[PDB]
Amino acid sequence: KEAIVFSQKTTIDQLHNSLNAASKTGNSNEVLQDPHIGDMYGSVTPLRPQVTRMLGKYAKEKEDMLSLRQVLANAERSYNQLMDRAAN
Amino acid sequence: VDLSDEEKDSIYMFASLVEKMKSRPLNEILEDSKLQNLAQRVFASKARLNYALNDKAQKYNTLIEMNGKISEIMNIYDRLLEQQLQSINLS
């Protein structure tokens, strides 16, 4: 289901660029109309929610892994220290 | 691609346990097994954690990026429709 959104990775770019080309021409109507632009908007616009969701998720997860890694980071150090006194 | 709770639980476990051992009357007194077999698992787990961590970050960015564009789209399209409707109004 995550794929439902990562797929649109290109439509977004596409719609972006074309709309962008417009905002620097003031041809307004043309782009505003045109079924294709409508079409891409009609499929991108609705991803806001899903996309909003996924952001929080991976936002969290990334936060967690970093905290866990930090913990592991420390234990390792401790381990190694305790180990050093095992060398000699 | 995703760390399990079992793996995650072996970390605070190992970490904590390392302290119960921080100052004990020998090193071998710890290098008996439970510590060494635990360490082994935990250490191996570094690679998955990173692999898993990296994947989360990557995605997030791909998603930050996508979002950004989406905004800009739903930002231009308005600025354009706005003027367009104003023109009509100014008549």
From Swiss-Prot, chain A:
The lineage of its organism: Eukaryota, Fungi, Dikarya, Ascomycota, Saccharomycotina. Coiled coil: none annotated. Present with 358 molecules/cell in log phase SD medium. This is Class E vacuolar protein-sorting machinery protein HSE1. It is found in: Endosome membrane. Component of the ESCRT-0 complex composed of HSE1 and VPS27. Interacts with the ESCRT-I subunit VPS23, the UBP7 deubiquitinase and the E3 ligase RSP5. May form a complex composed of VPS27, HSE1 and DOA1. Interacts (via SH3 domain) with DOA1. It comes from Saccharomyces cerevisiae (strain ATCC 204508 / S288c) (Baker's yeast). Component of the ESCRT-0 complex which is the sorting receptor for ubiquitinated cargo proteins at the multivesicular body (MVB) and recruits ESCRT-I to the MVB outer membrane. Belongs to the STAM family.
UniProtKB/Swiss-Prot annotation, chain B:
It comes from the Eukaryota. Coiled coil: none annotated. It is found in: Endosome membrane. Component of the ESCRT-0 complex composed of HSE1 and VPS27. Interacts with ENT3 and ENT5, the ESCRT-I subunits VPS23 and VPS28 and with the COPIb subunits SEC27, SEC28 and SEC33. May form a complex composed of VPS27, HSE1 and DOA1. Interacts with DOA1. Interacts with ubiquitin. Present with 172 molecules/cell in log phase SD medium. The FYVE domain is involved in the binding to phosphatidylinositol 3-phosphate (PtdIns(3)P) which is required for the association to endosomal membranes. Both IUM domains are necessary for efficient binding to ubiquitin. Component of the ESCRT-0 complex which is the sorting receptor for ubiquitinated cargo proteins at the multivesicular body (MVB) and recruits ESCRT-I to the MVB outer membrane. Controls exit from the prevacuolar compartment (PVC) in both the forward direction to the vacuole and the return to the Golgi. Allows VPS10 to return to the (trans-Golgi network) TGN from the PVC. Might also function as an alternate adapter in the COPIb clathrin-like coat. Belongs to the VPS27 family. This is Vacuolar protein sorting-associated protein 27. The chain holds residues 348 to 438 of 622 of the full protein.
